[PDB]
């Protein structure tokens, strides 16, 4: 007789899938989270471009001596690491294209400001800041999508592990635990001249099926000797 | 003879801890993520208060007919659902206190604007917008802390499951799989007049220890009968 389906292989498979699922869900979550750690920063700094743009107009209207320094601050912010790092493959096209537009818009705005052209400013600032606002909103929505992805993966991971464990344990109980208990009972009985119990089920394709067959025969012979 | 440590109880315990860890890490992650789904929105809208505040000054300097509508827009934004929902127990005191300050500051700003008081505006707008900027930054940092918490829990969950599974499988292999294989070998041997093999180790406190003892005796008697 042989064991067609050894428990060692079956168990190894079951635990492998548990770990694979844990690693997959965890790895995707962490990768997504890693790409997201500066989402809030990005939305703050991008948003600040809107305030800085109107502060420049306020500076111009008022003859503020801070106008040049504020122009330089806007350019630094626009070109901050957190915004420049958006030009990467996994960031959506729309985010990158909007950012490109803001950079082009700034060149015209900074030039008009250098010529002190207030009427141009007044005629254009609404549209100019609208375009920044849409950039910020795109970043916001991108941040939201990434977080929902993490929620989905976290949920599916937990559900998936719960489900794998449920069936794994069920299989171990039906194919290992219950038959072992039957073998122990039959053993303990046979060991005390109880010999007319139901014979063990031998249908399992694992080690316990083989032990049941051998037991049924180590037992049946005794009963006949005595008996 | 008895079984002092039944496999059923040992297995039930091991899988329980696997699931408990999965549920705990998943539950904390999801609760934290749930509290965070509007973090980006909050930072966008809060940030916009800075731009709106300078736009009001620009409106005042220029005699804009949009001044009143912009005043009403600022108040709507300040009191948006996403910001009003910040007054909840799990949001840090500092976020809530800053928000309270912005609300008080607005009352004075809106009044001065209703009196058209430009010199007061020019003398106060820097400090006023600084206070909004610190609010936005507090929201940013709060968002960052929550995300790091999710990273930690995700990581510890995955590591924890990997570790539980490693030892669980190790125990099942040492206490169930290996002894079962020995029982099968001894069985198959005995079934073919091989009777001088090493006797089975009987030290396991589970079902396999008992089966080994009974086997060692169902076998030893045969060898003597024949042999």
């Amino acid at each position: 007789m042989i064991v067609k389906r050894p428990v060692s292989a079956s168990l190894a498979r079951a635990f492998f899938y548990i770990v694979l699922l844990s690693i997959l869900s965890t790895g995707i979550a962490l990768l997504t989270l890693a790409s997201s750690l500066r989402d809030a920063e990005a939305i703050n700094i991008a948003g600040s471009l809107r305030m800085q743009s109107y502060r420049l107009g306020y500076d111009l209207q008022s003859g503020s001596p801070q106008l040049n320094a504020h122009r330089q601050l806007f350019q630094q912010a626009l070109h901050s690491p957190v915004l420049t790092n958006l030009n990467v493959w996994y960031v959506p096209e729309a985010v990158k294209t909007r950012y490109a537009h803001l950079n082009a818009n700034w060149l015209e705005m900074n030039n008009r400001l250098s010529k002190g052209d207030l009427p141009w400013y007044q005629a254009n600032i609404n549209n100019y800041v609208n375009q920044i606002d849409l950039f910020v909103l795109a970043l916001q929505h991108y941040a939201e999508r990434k977080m929902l992805l993490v929620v989905a993966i976290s949920l599916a991971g937990g559900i998936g592990i719960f489900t794998l464990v449920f069936f794994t344990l069920r299989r171990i109980r039906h194919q290992v635990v219950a038959p072992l208990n039957q073998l122990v009972t039959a053993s303990q009985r046979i060991e005390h001249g109880q010999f007319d119990s139901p014979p063990l089920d031998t249908n399992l394709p694992n080690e316990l099926g083989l032990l049941a067959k051998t037991f049924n025969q180590m037992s049946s012979e005794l009963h006949k000797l005595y008996r």
Side-chain angles (χ1 to χ4, degrees), chain A residues 1-114 116-220 222-223 225-226:
Chain A
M1 40 191 57
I2 66 159
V3 179
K4 285 175 178 66
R5 299 282 183 272
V7 174
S8 71
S10 167
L11 291 174
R13 190 177 321 114
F15 282 108
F16 167 81
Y17 287 127
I18 289 175
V19 169
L20 181 70
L21 183 66
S22 174
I23 281 168
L24 254 47
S25 55
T26 295
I28 298 169
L30 287 175
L31 226 47
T32 305
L33 284 163
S35 75
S36 298
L37 298 187
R38 294 166 70 104
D39 288 350
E41 182 184 352
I43 295 159
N44 188 353
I45 290 182
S48 77
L49 299 182
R50 308 178 283 212
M51 178 269 295
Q52 292 182 57
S53 294
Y54 264 104
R55 183 171 60 192
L56 285 168
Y58 167 87
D59 282 349
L60 188 47
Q61 286 172 324
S62 74
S64 171
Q66 293 182 304
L67 177 62
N68 287 345
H70 278 157
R71 289 166 65 214
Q72 202 164 318
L73 186 57
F74 178 91
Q75 189 161 308
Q76 152 178 123
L78 179 62
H79 296 154
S80 307
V82 75
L83 301 188
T84 64
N85 288 346
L86 291 173
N87 293 310
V88 164
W89 68 268
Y90 55 81
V91 171
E93 181 268 351
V95 167
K96 288 176 300 213
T97 292
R98 292 196 173 282
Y99 183 53
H101 280 298
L102 301 195
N103 277 293
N105 291 351
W106 171 233
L107 296 177
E108 163 97 280
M109 173 65 71
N110 194 26
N111 187 231
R112 294 285 189 159
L113 291 170
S114 79
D117 190 346
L118 179 55
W120 180 93
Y121 183 96
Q122 297 175 152
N124 286 271
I125 186 58
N126 187 60
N127 175 254
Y128 181 93
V129 171
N130 275 355
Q131 277 177 72
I132 302 170
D133 203 49
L134 287 160
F135 176 62
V136 179
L137 187 63
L139 286 174
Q140 187 198 306
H141 291 336
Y142 175 47
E144 290 167 354
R145 288 182 232 116
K146 290 191 292 170
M147 190 166 286
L148 208 63
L149 174 55
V150 180
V151 164
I153 300 158
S154 298
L155 195 51
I159 283 168
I161 281 177
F162 182 93
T163 297
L164 283 180
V165 163
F166 178 86
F167 288 102
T168 297
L169 180 148
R170 188 176 201 74
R171 195 197 315 282
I172 290 169
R173 283 184 33 264
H174 293 209
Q175 295 192 342
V176 179
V177 181
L180 271 180
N181 287 159
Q182 296 295 332
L183 270 161
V184 164
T185 297
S187 291
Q188 284 182 308
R189 279 179 190 170
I190 261 63
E191 202 183 317
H192 289 109
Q194 283 195 9
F195 277 108
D196 280 320
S197 36
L200 302 170
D201 180 330
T202 59
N203 288 345
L204 288 173
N206 67 8
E207 283 80 358
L208 283 101
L210 187 154
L211 287 178
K213 294 170 190 157
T214 71
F215 184 93
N216 280 342
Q217 306 306 321
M218 287 186 295
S219 163
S220 173
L222 300 184
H223 181 37
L225 295 190
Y226 139 46

